[PDB]
Amino acid sequence: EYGAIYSVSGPVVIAENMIGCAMYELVKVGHDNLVGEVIRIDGDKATIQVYEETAGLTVGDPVLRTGKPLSVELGPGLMETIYDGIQRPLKAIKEESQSIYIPRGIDTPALDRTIKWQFTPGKFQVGDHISGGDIYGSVFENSLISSHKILLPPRSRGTITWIAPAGEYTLDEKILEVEFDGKKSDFTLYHTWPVRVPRPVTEKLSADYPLLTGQRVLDALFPCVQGGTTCIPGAFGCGKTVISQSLSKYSNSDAIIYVGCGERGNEMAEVLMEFPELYTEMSGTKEPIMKRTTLVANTSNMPVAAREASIYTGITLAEYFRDQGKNVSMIADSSSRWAEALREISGRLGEMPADQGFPAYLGAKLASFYERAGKAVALGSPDRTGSVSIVAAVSPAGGDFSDPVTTATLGITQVFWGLDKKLAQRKHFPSINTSVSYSKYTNVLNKFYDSNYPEFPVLRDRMKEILSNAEELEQVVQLVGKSALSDSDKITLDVATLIKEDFLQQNGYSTYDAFCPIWKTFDMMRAFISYHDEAQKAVANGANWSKLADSTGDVKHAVSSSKFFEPSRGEKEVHGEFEKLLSTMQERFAESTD
Amino acid sequence: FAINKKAVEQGFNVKPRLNYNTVSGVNGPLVILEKVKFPRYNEIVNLTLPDGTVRQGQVLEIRGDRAIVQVFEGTSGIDVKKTTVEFTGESLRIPVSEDMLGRIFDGSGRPIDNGPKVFAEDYLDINGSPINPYARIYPEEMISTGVSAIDTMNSIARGQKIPIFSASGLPHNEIAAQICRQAGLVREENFSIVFAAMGVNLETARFFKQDFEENGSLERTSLFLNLANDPTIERIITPRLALTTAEYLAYQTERHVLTILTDMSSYADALREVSAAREEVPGRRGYPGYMYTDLSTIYERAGRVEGRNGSITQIPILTMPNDDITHPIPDLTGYITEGQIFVDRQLHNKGIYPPINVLPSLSRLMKSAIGEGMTRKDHGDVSNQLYAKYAIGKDAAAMKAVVGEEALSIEDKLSLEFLEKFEKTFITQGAYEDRTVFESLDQAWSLLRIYPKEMLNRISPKILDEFYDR
Amino acid sequence: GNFKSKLKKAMLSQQITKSTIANKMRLKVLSAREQSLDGIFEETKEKLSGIANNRDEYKPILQSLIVEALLKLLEPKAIVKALERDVDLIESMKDDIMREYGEKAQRAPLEEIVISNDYLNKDLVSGGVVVSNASDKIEINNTLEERLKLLSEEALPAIRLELYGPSKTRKFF
Amino acid sequence: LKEFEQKNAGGVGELEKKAEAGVQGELAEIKKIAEKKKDDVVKILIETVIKPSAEVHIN
């Protein structure tokens, strides 16, 4: 088919003579073959969304079909590579065009056609029968990851005729030829897949293994588990970057997909060179970390349409990797910008909006997007298992914090991390709100705790109750000051303040200001609770609390400085210091208890 | 050297332009044509009224042989029989040359200094293209300003988009005048300054002109003046022209450029004006639900490129029309621009120039900008302790106002004393008085010494031991 | 205080004077360059006037002008307004253009042409043509002087480059 | 104060030469280069003006 550009209005184009097309099929438009998508069918006239700028267009311009939906390439070379919203390597484009700008209509292969990859035959030989999604050999990619498995794309089976031998092969070379009902299928190293269709899987499964982050409070109060979602609302300058950096640089995830949509960009301009030199000894003394994570960016100046395609691309890649069984965790900059783009494009279309001007289908979009995550058993003969987690942020600025995007997100999320703002003016980080936040995974994580830390769960309840009492008492402090406080009330007030100051701060950058292991956090829990309970008991048995505190003195400095230990000093020296601190504090209380 | 010949060889190429007389409908700032023979999208046209006056406009949307033109300079006196509209086949451009320095242009980018036309070296599309993030240098090279507050708590690096949040009847103009008067780095090349004046009054313009003449920096600067007595539609163009000029200078001459964008409030107002007639979906408070993208386009046009020494730093001036921060404009700006400078009102009410309240302000890039070799290492933790003490003084005074000194602890009195000394000696400075960063650190240490060694908790032991004494 | 105020005033006076002088100098330089360009334009106008006076040159050039105008219009009919003293060559080449219009295109040749019974002021233009739609609503100006005016700005960057050679300060273009 | 004023009153006179001395150089240089390139510019301009072109629109 061929058609003419009948009418243009901003990012919306209307063509003609388009009868054999189907909605969501890719199309090439303009003399520069810009990419677009089909939305509305009006007999022969069709409305195209364009992922590129305009003002070069004119009436009566050619258009072309593609006979395929929107898809991305899956295979090798994906890692260490930064792509645009539509999977184009920015560095390759820059260094080929020899320009600092981003020329429109520039087209390049999604994957390098120059690297010869080292393939070796796998669990299959010549003349076999295979099914969809089955690993049939691997290929070495990186020092960090040295076995990039290769498997048939889903919806493909039959009896294979020939398998290629080991050696170096460019991804474009055929290696396996199969016969479903005839030799009508030969498979190279890589393939593609339509984004909108979630990839199949053997079966979903429960997710209980905890997901570590190193951040003290998160692992303490509102843990996140491998497989599942978590929203992080907040305004500008709310430390969102801090959490992003922490989770990226520190985690047990087997792969990370950082996604930037409608972002400052300069965050890329920092992280890009920060990322590789931020060596982390994962899988042993393996310094490189960029092999642990790719990155797709989409700055604000980019055409609005890509700000949606980026998210689908990221989730697709995460699912693809999870199909190999390696755990994954994709991260989003702000779905708020995605909602903005959806609203703007729908309005330009002209359909009546829902509340706040947003398209009604936003809720379904978000629900499906989050549903794509989880933990399951990967399809394939080798019978491996994978899992994908997800986290994202929000940008509430409409005058509240219950805007439809936030409400829709909360409706499907299990972990909620509310963020304050005054804490930022107080330079207190992480600036989360322990007052308004919750999680729904502790119930099952209790099994893992009993496996390793059976005492751990029973402490956090009392831990949070301390804070609860703190904000229950502060009211009278504002009202009539501290006039009728008993010794116990002051004990609770002061220990809560100490907790806020010490245990609720990851400030700075150092061994103890960058990461905290689970055991160190557990020991700090033990120390804090022991101190509180012993002080309360000593005063209850009879002790002038003001005098008792003035006499105990340096116990506070000792417990506080306990955090300043170096995490990962062998899990014994730190343990010994915690033990001796406990002994000293208990003996000091005993002497001063009466 | 001869590559310029290769680029401009196309210049000796002449193509005619059609004269249409097909006015088919007009409603306010919109005109409609017909059978226009393959019009190009977002190109420019010229109108000749029967009186014999020339206006200008652009096409905004196109369907089959029907284009909607937008006229920047009014729409009155429009007929259907004596209207001469001729296309241009291009988007609007601008005569660009290094020669314009020391020239004054109207809001429409035309000389208004009684000077002749400038023989531009080239022309550029007013709107630009996004820059590949892969070729962006993260900011460094902290910038001195001669102002204690900014240089001590919100240091600025070469290449940064940071707004100023002020309200009506505040010396923001004078603050900017002092800043440009006290530009430079502490660690040189005199800055090249671009001023974009949109929707202002005569007094502000004359003040700025006199300030530039006094400092003498006029000779290395040029201006775009758009006042309140000029068409609102064209008002949105001036920032684009200024930004394009800054791009040309910085990234084809390797110059350090400073841009002062004024009255983003008026620009937003003009955006809302044009959107309302267009009948777009109002995102909030009437402002269209996509103006965020336009603000991004304006602001994300700054930074440092890999191979370009020249740098461009944007300091837009923003006025909240409620004395409030929750207004959509500052909210979106904060979402966009790293760093932010607030302006106090009580200090102005208390006659404390320059009236600034540090606590709301924040700089998200001062972290790497400061450090060793540029300042003594303490600077950062000193600033943090200053923040802590300042906030404690504020809330302690607030609570005292309810209970009074009788329920106050001694540390509360220390906080109040530190607050008063800080706000009456440290922040304040005369119109022509500047301080080195090291002098500011000396003042901060002197004020901090009011407290003992113990109360200082945001400071590592070694820093206290090294700088607690004189 | 009075001394400090007067010292600031003296600084202001000196700065005003020097800025004014610099402005005068730059204005004079730019005005001189403008004068040179204007002289060049005067010479160009003289050349156009001289060339218009030879029928031999005028005929093929006029034919090409009209052909270009028609190929812009893409209409089966057209009207031509020009100077009375030029109607001779137009009548000469009427059929030639009649067939050439289609020849360059791939449709049928033109149908008809009307020479408007009204003509431009001689002082207004030395020579050239003005072509108009059969409905006299869409028209194209190919007058030679108008051609000069149009070219005098689009090609200006190359003109200045030639006149002043390399920029000496552009390191990326 | 009067003595200080006497300095800013006689300041006139030098600025004249200070500026004009500088200006003559560029005035003369521009004059000479323009004189050199007169004929070349005229030739190219005439060629461009008389240039015959014929192009149907892309569509």
Give the whole-angstrom CA distance, residue A502 versus residue A490. 18
* Distance between CA atoms of residues A83 and A298, nearest Å: 9
C3 Cβ neighbours under 8 A, 6+ residues apart = D1, D4
CA distances in angstroms from A590 to A541, A553, A593, A594, C118, listed in the order given:
11, 14, 5, 7, 119
Q: What token pair was written down for D2?
A: 């009067």
As given in the structure block, the two tokens for residue C35 are 């004068």
- Choosing from A155, A187, A219, the residue where a domain stops is A187
Q: Which residues contact A539 (CB under 8 A, 6 or more apart)?
A: A487, A488, A491, A545, A548
User: Rounded to an integer, what distance in angstroms lies between the CA atom of residue B205 and that of residue B221?
Assistant: 15
For residues A161 and A107, state if they share a domain: no
The DSSP output letter for B347 is H
Residue A341's CB is within 10 A of a number of other CB atoms, namely 21
Picking from A439, A454, A484, the residue at the C-terminal end of a domain is A439
Give the distance from residue C43's alpha carbon to the nearest chain B alpha carbon, in angstroms: 18
Pairing, β A328-331 against β A374-377: unpaired
Please give the structure tokens belonging to residue A40: 């509305």
Q: Which amino acid is at B316?
A: P
* Residues contacting residue C95 through CB under 8 Å, at least 6 positions apart: none
Q: Per-residue DSSP letters for B275-293?
A: HHHHTPPEEETTEETTHHH
Nearest-CA neighbor of B255 among B284, B221, B283, B232?
B221
According to DSSP, the residues that pair with A260 across neighbouring strands are A297
CA distance C96 to C99: 6
> Which residues of chain A have a CB within 8 Å of the CB of B307?
100
Residue carrying the six token digits 């979106």: B332
Token pair, residue A309, equals 């395609």
- Residues whose CB falls within 8 Å of the CB of residue D16, separated by 6 or more in sequence, listed in order: none
- Residue B194 buriedness (CB in 10 A; 0-12 / 13-18 / 19+): buried
Do A533 and A582 form a contact (C-beta atoms < 8 A)?
no
Residue among D48, D50, D56, D58 with most chain B CBs within 10 A, to mutate: D48
H runs (alpha helix) in A481-565: 487-502, 511-514, 518-540, 545-552, 555-562
CA-wise closest residue to B347 among B181, B144, B156, B149: B149
B-contacting residues in D 25-44 (Cβ below 8 Å): 44
A393/A413 same-domain check:
yes
Looking at the structure, tell me whether residues A431 and A514 fall in a common domain. no
Same domain, A237 and A380: yes
Cβ–Cβ contact C45 with B under 8 A: no
The shortest CB-CB distance from C104 to any of D15, D49, D54 is to D54
Tell me the sheet residues that pair with B197: B225
Given CB atoms, is D46 within the 8 Å cutoff of chain C?
yes
From the list B179, B463, B132, the residue with the least C-alpha distance to B313 is B179
The residue range of the domain holding A578 is 440-594
For residues A288 and C140, give the distance between their C-alpha atoms in angstroms, rounded to a whole number.
67
What is the C-alpha separation between B343 and B322, in angstroms, rounded? 14
End-to-end Cα spacing for chain B: 59
On whether the CB atoms of residues C171 and B252 are closer than 8 A, the answer is yes
Coil, strand or helix at B352: coil
Q: Which residues make beta-bridge pairs with B260?
A: B195
Helix (H, G, I), strand (E, B) or coil at A75: coil
Alpha carbons B404 and B388: distance in angstroms, whole number: 22
Q: Are residues A428 and A520 in the same domain?
A: no
Written as six digits, the tokens of A354 are 């829902």
Residue position matching structure tokens 């207190």: A428
**Alpha-helical segments (H) within B301-378:** 328-336, 346-349, 366-369
Which residue, A114, A124, A117, A111, is CA-closest to A167?
A: A117
Token pair 């910038």 is at which residue? B143
Nearest-angstrom CA–CA distance, B165 and B167: 7
Shared-domain flag, residues A414 and A469: no
Rounded Cα gap, residues A152 and A191, in angstroms: 9
Angle of helix A545-552 relative to helix A487-502, nearest 10 degrees?
40
Alpha-carbon dihedral B156, B157, B163, B169, rounded to 10 degrees: 40
Known binding residue B364? Answer is yes
Q: At what angle do helices B437-448 and B410-421 cross, to 10 degrees?
A: 150
Instruction: In whole angstroms, give the CA distance from residue A202 to residue C64.
Output: 74
Q: Do A59 and D58 touch (CB under 8 A)?
A: no
DSSP one-letter code for B272: H
Listed in sequence order, the residues at least 6 apart from A164 whose beta carbon sits closer than 8 Å to its beta carbon are A119, A121, A173, A174, A175, A176
Q: For chain A, report the end-to-end CA distance as a whole number of angstroms.
A: 94
Tokens representing B135 are 């070729």
SS3 percent helix, strand, coil of chain B, rounded to 5, is 35, 20, 40
**Experimental structure resolution, Å:** 4.8
Residues A108 and A254 in one domain: yes
Is B35:C73 a contact under the CB 8 Å cutoff? Answer: no
D50–B contact, CB cutoff 8 A: no
Q: Kindly list the distances between the CA atom of residue C119 and the CA atoms of A273, B5, C75, C123, in Å, as whole numbers in the listed order.
A: 71, 41, 22, 12
Are residues A454 and A327 part of one domain?
no
Q: C-alpha B214: how far from its chain's center?
A: 23
Task: Point out the domain boundary residue: A423, A439, A455.
Answer: A439
Whether A381 and A133 have beta carbons less than 8 Å apart is answered as no
Task: Tell me how far apart the alpha carbons of residues A102 and C10 are, in angstroms, rounded to a whole number.
Answer: 52
| Residues of chain A neighbouring B65 (CB-CB closer than 8 A) | 59
| A177 shares its domain with A238 | no
DSSP secondary structure of chain C: -HHHHHHHHHHHHHHHHHHHHHHHHHHHHHHHHHHHHHHHHHHHHHHHHHHHT-HHHHHHHHHHHHHHHHHHH--SEEEEE--GGGHHHHHHHHHHHHHHHHHHSSSPPP-EEEE-S----TTT-SS--EEEETTSSEEEE--HHHHHHHHHHHTHHHHHHHHH---SS-S--
Cβ partners under 8 Å of residue A452, min gap 6: none
> In degrees, to the nearest 5, what angle opens at C-alpha A371 toward C-alphas A224 and A205?
70
Breaks (C-N over 2.5 A) in chain A follow: none
Contact B4 C166 (CB under 8 A): yes
Domain count, chain A: 4
**Secondary structure (H, E, C), A193-218:** EECCCCCCCCEEECCCCEECCCCHHH
Dist CA A34 CA A22 (whole Å):
18
Q: Are strands A45-50 and A12-15 parallel, antiparallel or unpaired?
A: antiparallel
Residues A14 and A94 in one domain: no
B140 vs B142: CA distance, rounded Å: 6
Instruction: Give the whole-angstrom CA distance, residue B421 versus residue B427.
Output: 10
Whether the CB-CB separation of C81 and C130 falls below 8 Å is answered with yes
- Buried b / exposed e along A139-149 (16+ C-beta atoms within 10 A): bebeebbeebb
Q: Which of D44, D48, D57 sits opposite B14 (nearest CB)?
A: D48
| Same-domain pairing of A382 and A421 | yes
The two three-digit tokens of residue A395, written as one number: 């940008």
DSSP-assigned letter for residue B99: G
DSSP string, B133-184: GGGEEPPEEEE--S-HHHHHHS-EEES-B--EEE-SS-THHHHHHHHHHT-S
DSSP code, position A594: -
Residues of D in contact with B13 (CB under 8 A): 48
Q: Note whether A425 and A544 are same-domain residues.
A: no
